[model samples]
Target: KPIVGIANGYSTITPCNMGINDLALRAEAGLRTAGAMPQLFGTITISDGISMGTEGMKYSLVSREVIADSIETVCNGQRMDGVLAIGGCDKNMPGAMIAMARLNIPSIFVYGGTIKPGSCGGMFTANTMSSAFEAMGMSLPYSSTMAAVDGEKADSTEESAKVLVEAIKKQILPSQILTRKAFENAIAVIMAVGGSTNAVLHLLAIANTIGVPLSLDDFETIRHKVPVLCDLKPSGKYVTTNLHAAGGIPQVMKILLVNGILHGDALTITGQTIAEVLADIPDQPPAGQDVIHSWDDPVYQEGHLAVLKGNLATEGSVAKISGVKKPVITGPAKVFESEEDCLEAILAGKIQAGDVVVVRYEGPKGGPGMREMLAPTSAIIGAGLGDSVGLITDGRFSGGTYGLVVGHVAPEAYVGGAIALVQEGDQITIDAGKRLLQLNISEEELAQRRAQWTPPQPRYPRGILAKYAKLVSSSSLGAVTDIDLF
Candidate 1:
């Protein structure tokens, strides 16, 4: 039998991946019918939404490394001929890509599509729609191939001996592509669909692992020019099913290619250039579909997300600017040292309009794991302050998070960024239109606060949290683990 390794991330706990088990079963049946033996193996997966605002979120990024390493270990241990990795959560797609790049075997990646937006009773539903029904799959092909082609470039394989070796130098995969450029094209589509802001961090970490040389600058450049054409939530009112009805991501990708936003020359898994794959696709989307807009008509002139920089985020910060109508807010800071504190404040109605909520000490090193601030952000929206209030954090926001919220502030408060210096009464301004986050305090005053600022004692002085805190990088740098030998 032609043995294929199925690297599956199936967890009942995560609604995002609950259907993966069935998909894996279905895939196995197909492979068997095609005269192949499928060996299914499980990998760990954690739900970002469930872990949000908790210590568990720290493991979200770290889990990517584990998934990659585990897939590599299992596939190599079994000496499989080829592989297929399937995932659902934010990190799983890239995690699978990393393992594929390292292995460099014939591989395919299946992004477990996002859930459909739940039905509302008389359009008065209270639940957060599950993610425009997996418009996420639009970016999956880009991620997998980004690593698959690059890994194949290693020109190594399972030779007569156990050691992986390259027979030729600079050999390219059938895809005949470079992963770096592929990602640039993918992110543009990600922005156009108003996809997850978390994509920025996940993509950056994948790039770092595979030596792709991608930077936050790449994201900023792409988002500025690509229009948000998809009318899907947490930004719009549609779902992934609507996209499928309108011919799916391929239809949109083809449009971007025609418009010169996506590079048509890039290769994909089908052994066809992206241009060749979309050559037969119609120039326009299916009629009667209002979910995806035409080039002339866009939901927003620019992409959904933006990467901003300022005195606070010396390295840079991220904001989901497309969903927020009023992107500029100037108000006094309501600083909280932890997400819990801020969430509590939000629930208690202590947070007011025109007040900037500063949730700090939750950055990579600060949170000892850099938690996502979904709980608080969701609370703000639930409280009906989505447009009137503003939130900033040195941590992150979930893909489901919307509003005038800015996250991933660099040089996190724990390490003495401008955010830590902010007091409860200090005036802070977030101008998304200009892409700036500023503290109105004078430099001398901030300098004094900085001098007095003392790093908090380690909350978890031992165990995994403590260990991660010591190794994690800043939020701006994808909040990845760092090993400083020097």
Candidate 2:
């Protein structure tokens, strides 16, 4: 029998992955029935919500690399014939895909599934990446949006195992499915769904692993063509379940196909073209649901994810513009050295409406982990400055984040990016229409500050983080560690 490895991301630390073990068990049963020997393994997950404002959040993005390295190590060491990776958190899916790309084995990614909608149950990072993976032809169609605890999720997980065995038999490698057009399809889906900005980083990482020549500009190109159609939150009224109930992603893909937005000829895991998979699914939402709007009357006329560039972010910065009422904000800078300090100020009501919060030295090398700024972002909304204030960082943001926020600025402040030169009360402009994130300071003034700037000592002199900080590339290059390997 073929040895099929099951990389299970089930941890009690975060509820996002708590149900993954049950799905893994179902996969094992399915693999056995399909005549393959299943070997279940484990990976790690870090809860962005739990460690939002703390020093621990720095480990969040770093965990993705570790998960990929661990999975690749085990699969290569064991010489597994095939893999079925099940994940539920923000980083797990991308990490799984990176390993599969490295191994070049017949593999299938399974989303552990979305939790039932609670207080903040919109198209966050986990669901966003799941849907992107599905569109990218890495997972079974309609598998991304199913509820975690639902019977359908278990059934689909088992079915995915059977599919993986068949893929192994047929030698359907991930490289054949994850083509450039397929990635374009994925990006289009992300735009239409108003997915998290992390999609930019993860997609770039996966493409880098697969040796695809993808860049931030590709996202910008797709953003102009695809409109945001789904009315999900933290920007809209509907939850992910409402999207599922309204016939799922296939329905959305159907609309895109007819409008010539999606690459319908792109191949999927089912050995079917994207158009073929959507043949059975309707093009419109279920009657009067309003979960997904029409193309003519989309939630946003163009895509919500914007890749902004200027003196401030020479490499590029990602901004979620779905719920942004003020697309253009030129405000005075309020600089903070860390997320905790910025968060404290926001919570303490020190941050005002016309302020452009500059949270610096928190990039891949600086934070040494590139933590998400969900704590301060949520506080901004809590403090009722979501529409007026703007925040820019070298770190990143959660999928639940929606405001005049820009992240993934490079070169980061730790390496003396332009953001490090920003002083208190400096004019900073965030313009979505122009796709610009500018610091309105004289070039000479910036050079003067640059001359005075000194690099900070390494936060972790010797540790995994220090190693990561040393190896990781700029967020503009996906913040990946193995750029030099290939």
Candidate 3:
């Protein structure tokens, strides 16, 4: 019998992946029934929600590289014939993909699935990546959005194991499925569903790992053509479960397929074209279900994710353009070197309307982890400034974040990007229609400020965080650790 490895992200530290052990067991049973010797293994996961706004959150993006390294080390070292990888959190999916892409073996990725509806009750990073992967021809069809504790998730996980055995027998590899066109399909799906801005980062990292030429420009091109159809998540009304109930990603793809938005010829892991996968699913969502709006009446006329560029973000910055009533905002910069300071100011009522919150030194290399800004962003909303206030960061935002927020600002403060020169009361403008994020200070003043600016000391002088700070690339380039390292 062929030896298959089960690399699962199972941890008691986070609730998002607590149920994965059970799913891994089901996968093991299925692999055995299919006549393959199953070897179960474990990996790491960092809870973005639990660590949000803290120093701990800096480990979040760095954890993606760690997870990828861990999985690759295990699978390659063990010399497994094939593998079934499972993940539940934001970084887990991309980390798993990077490892599988590196191994280039007959492998399958299984999503640990969504949780019960007590939290954000909207599409966040995990679900956004899950939907994107399925659209990208990764994971099995309709397997991305199932509830975590549901019997359906267990059945699908086991079924996924059987599918993997067949893949191993046939020697179907990830390289065959993760094509450039498949990536375009994933981008279109992400745009259609108004996915997390983190998708931009994760997908770019995965594309770089697989040697596919993907960039922020590709997302912008797709964003222009694809309409945001799913009314779910941080910006919309429903949750992932509602999408599952309304026919899941297949139904969403079915709509895009008919509209000439999605590429039907993209190959999926099932050894069938995406067109074949959707042939049996209904093109239209269930009647009277506003969860998924039609092309004629979309949630947004164009994709929600926007790539902004100007003097401030010459490389680029990502913004969720879903819930913003005002696309243009010019305000004075209220600078904070850390998220904690920013959050305190917001809670202390220092953040007023028309103020652009500039949180710096928390970027990939600066924070040495590139923490998420969910806490401050949420506080801005909680303080009734979601519409009036605009937040910009070299750090990232959770998929659960909404409003006039822009993240992934490149050439972060530590390296002295234009954002570093920004001081309290400097006029800043975030123009969505123009796709621009500008610091209104004159070139002469900016040059003077830049001359005076000195790089900050390393937050983590040792350990994984320090190494990550040294290895990571710009946010515009996917913040990947290994690029141009030939």
Candidate 4:
């Protein structure tokens, strides 16, 4: 076997994923413990939270080419046998997965777990999707509401959601973490930020790149069997650090084991079985009671990645509705064609209760270069309208994005798809109860909307910008270049 090469995807931007450096050390230590040489390399990093502007967005997506070239050049040039990839942020994982998949070597993906959530009210939560809301309110938005929720529901009045919200807003540290707290705290930050829905897509793409028939659909299967045991914020109640304190992934693995979610027979980075490693984890914290609890006390009965098909997404779509809850699936469609207009409406309080806020135009071939669709969901929820609002996007949401929100509507706007035809107040309904989406428009009217829809004009022409818009695949196919064959 060739020496192991490490691709550390650490960036100054996306401070939450900044822990990849530490992850590399841990992996390296593990590798050394297993007796392997470790060679190091750096790849391009981009954070949607940071790296704005034309050049930056362009750099973020197109950097995949550089990453691909870098790893391959080194693998073939350095004569490495296997690749130990350490990634967390959106692109790095996918990029590494894509390249290593193509190389078909024994490539191991080690995620640098999310940072700890801020310590607050003697409790913890993450900053992922909720951060989108926090960024909006810019103040103590949910102070009263969360406190009230905590007071009403929490078994212990000692810890409150208000405490988590206030601490997250006030103590905005790097990658949304606190060194003083335990491991679960850091995991909380990772869960928040709702970094990229593309994470799942990219992971699938990576698997496909290496001839593994993994897809978002496959993740759906994984989700069904696995409970959302990781109560690492955004979706669940506690944070990642809380998880570590209560007992890190070991606790989660135990849950997975009981549920038979993880395939212990399948090979992992270490040759030892997943069950073995889990069994070896000493001092495993007793699982919590709520969403973070064990199998006996699971967060949800189903998986996190839920696939849905309806009039909205004719080509089919997905949402990380792992432990998400929504009672009123029927509502008037508050559809907006663009982000600027929708956000303007959000600020104007135009978005109302009992409305399914549909925001389109974000897909592989449309606006924002495959931007994650969780932002508006956070805004809608944090506005104290979560119970009444649901988001349906041809765009994507992180597997971590939980809530009543539904995303990953397919056949994006640029391609004359269903999402664009959803006019405001056109009576849209998400039959998630039956796992379907229905537009109130007649079949003829729907056909007319589809017929009237023209492919969007190209956003770029000159350089790499032009190339990405032209060459990238849709979100369903991992939204990368040269993935068409799959």
Candidate 5:
């Protein structure tokens, strides 16, 4: 009999992993159906978002490699014939795929999925309670209007539990599961949901692990074809709960499927085709509900999220261009040496509107971990300058971050990317429509500045951070530690 390793990222450190053990148990039963014995194992995962801009955050990207190594060690050591990996948080999913690739074992990856979006008068992502996946994943519809419970009852888990409770009470069959098509459907949903930019990195990283060769160009292509149909947090005005009340992810998928936006021919883990799965599901969009819009009346004509390339980010960069925040934003540079300095400026009321803030030396090599600048990004929004201020950095952002922000400015400052040479008060113009970020300086002037620039002294010249800085690739390459262990 074959023994299958169940690589589970179930832990108390984050709510994203809180319910994953139950998911792993369900997957174990499925393995038994294939005449295989399921062996459970655990991996370490950190909530990098909650700890953004702090010392704890240095472990975020590094945890991806560790998770991959730990899972591979267990599966290979036990000599499992196949593997089923369950992941909840940001790094777990891609990290699991990395190990599966290195091992070359027949494997399946499962996302623990996102929680229901919370209600704070308007839709706030369950961001306080769950992972980026939770904000992007589907929610099922129910006819009952839930009364908002008081006190601690407002936790997103309590709201998300409705879907699970309904699943059990109705004995709903497991209709949709992982398949190549399901993955494509998920991508389509990401476009529709205005999901996390980090999802782009995770998707690209996982695809690379399997040698699939996906790129930002592919994201740009799909994004143009899919309209931002759902109004969710970080960009729009609703939450996952509103999505469920309207009709959930399946209803949203149905819209994409009928309009020929989604590829229906893809297979699913349920032994049925994606077309077959959705053929039976009903459209649950509530009457007068504007949360999930109709095809003729989408939230946006195309995806709000995008990836752009230009002289400033020769490799590529990411942005969310949802509203009429102007296609072009030109302002004097407010360059900060680190995210902390930027955050200090933001809180101190120093970063005002009409200023393009450039936070550098915080990329993969410089940060030695590419910390998520959620604190700084959130401060910008909290300061009510999301529309007016523009922020760019080599370091990335959490899914919860929004505004005229661009990240993953490759050839990071430590290595002297164009961003490093940028000086305070330099004229910086960002044109989203043209996909260009230009510094007013001529090439000749920039060359002089580049010559004078020197890398900042190492903040972590020893320990794991030093090793990571030495081995990690650029944020454009997923900020992963891809160097050889030997």
Candidate 6:
């Protein structure tokens, strides 16, 4: 009988994905029951939500090597034939995928899966909760909403959030209810409110490790084709959990197919073809949809997300276009080499219509690792310019984000790319009609940024990065920065 090793990414750092241990356990039980033996193995874990500073980013970045080493150890020690990578959140899933790819073994994404959002008073979701703090003339900053909860509610949990939501719905007072509908609402909202900026890094990395030709460019192609769905949180009202209850990925896949945006038949771990999997999931978006999304009613007609390219980004970058607030594609370029500078300009009201914000130096060398640029993007959106605004960076974006931003250029400026030569008052045009990002800078100047660029020195001497340097692909390749280690 074949044996399967389970690799988990859950750690005390990531509460959201910490639940995946049991998920892997269940998968093992199922695998054992099916005749194959299941062997459990633990690996390095990272939770960006909790980790901080270089400590956090380093944990998330280097942890991939640990994941690979763990898998190899289990395979050698326990002698497993296949594996299942279990995780959730930003790094774990992708990290495991990298290891499994090298192993070239049968595997499944037994992730912790997405969690439902807890409700506050009238609104539902994490993004809204954060937004309410940032919204103009809003109440409280962080702790205000916590106190608003009824005295009966003393703790926060998915179950507790459900109870509060039910109570809020009864008054019909526009109370924030974390209902299934609310989770869906928050999903939309999160996307709108600047979804996780780490998307391009995490999702693309996973795809690359799986040996898919998926790169920043592939993301760009998909973006042009898919629709920006989800009408809740950050982007709209519901949370990720609403998507699960309403039908999870299958329901969304159905809508994507109807729009001619998705080709689910491509591939997946279930081994069941996309069509077969869809057929297997009885929900099928259901006949009378309860709340996630109406089969007929979609998040948008085009891809809710996108990957863009141009001289600024030779490789590609991502943006979430779903639930766009301003949806205006035409804008003049407003260039900033750093997020710090951009924030200063934004705070000073240095922005105008048709102005594009080009932010650079948030990439590999700048990050010296996985330094995502979502913070600057969200700050831009918080300035009430998310719709008409576009971001350009060497860094990457998150999965749920929908925008006109461009990123993921190969041979990053740190490694002799063109973005370094950028200067103020440069003319940049964004022609979404042709799916391009062009900087009016002279080619000679670009050559200068590249010529002046120097490859960053290695950060660590004898650890994962040393190993990673030999394996990981650069930005255009997937930003995985780690090759497979079976």
Highest lDDT scorer: 2
User: What is candidate 6's lDDT per residue for 1-486, written digit by digit as tens?
Assistant: 666666655654443444545555555655655566667766655554533322345345556556666776676677656665554443444455456555554444333333334322212222232321112111111111232122211221222222212222232111121122222222232232224434446445544554444455544555445444455454556654454445544455455445454343433322233445455545335655443454355455444445556776666655555544543355556666555677788878897545677766556554445454446566667677655666666755432224466666555655655565556666676555555667776778777656665665555555655555445556665566545455
Q: Please, what are the lDDT tens digits per residue for candidate 1 over residues 192-232?
A: 77777776776676556555677777888898888887786
Tens-place lDDT digits, model 4, residues 441-467: 889999988887776677665576666
Better of 3 and 5 by lDDT: 3
Query: Of 2 and 5, which scores higher on lDDT?
Result: 2
lDDT of each: 0.65, 0.85, 0.84, 0.51, 0.65, 0.48
Runs of candidate 5 with Cα error greater than 4 angstroms are 12-18, 29-34, 48-50, 89-92, 113-186, 242-247, 270-273, 281-289, 382-384, 399-403, 451-457, 483-486
Residue 83 error, candidate 5, Å: 1.9
lDDT (tens digit, per residue) of candidate 2 on 194-239: 8878888989888888888888889999999999989887677888
Candidate 4 TM-score to native = 0.70
Task: List TM-scores for all candidates, in order.
Answer: 0.81, 0.94, 0.94, 0.70, 0.79, 0.68
Model 2 clash tally, residue pairs? 0
Q: How accurate locally is residue 42 in candidate 3, as Cα lDDT from 0 to 100? A: 86
lDDT value for model 2: 0.85
Estimate the overall C-alpha local distance difference test score of candidate 4: 0.51
Consecutive 10-residue window with the lowest summed lDDT within model 3: 115-124
In model 5, what is the error at residue 284, expressed in angstroms?
9.4
Q: What is the lDDT of residue 483 in candidate 5?
A: 43
Worst 10 residues of 2 by lDDT: 9-18
**Which residues of candidate 6, in runs, are more than 4 Å off?**
13-18, 24-37, 48-55, 89-91, 118-203, 210-212, 215-217, 228-232, 255-271, 280-284, 287-297, 323-357, 378-390, 397-405, 448-471, 482-486
Badly placed stretches (over 4 Å) of model 1 are: 1-4, 11-18, 25-38, 48-54, 79-81, 89-93, 102-105, 114-178, 382-384, 399-403, 482-486
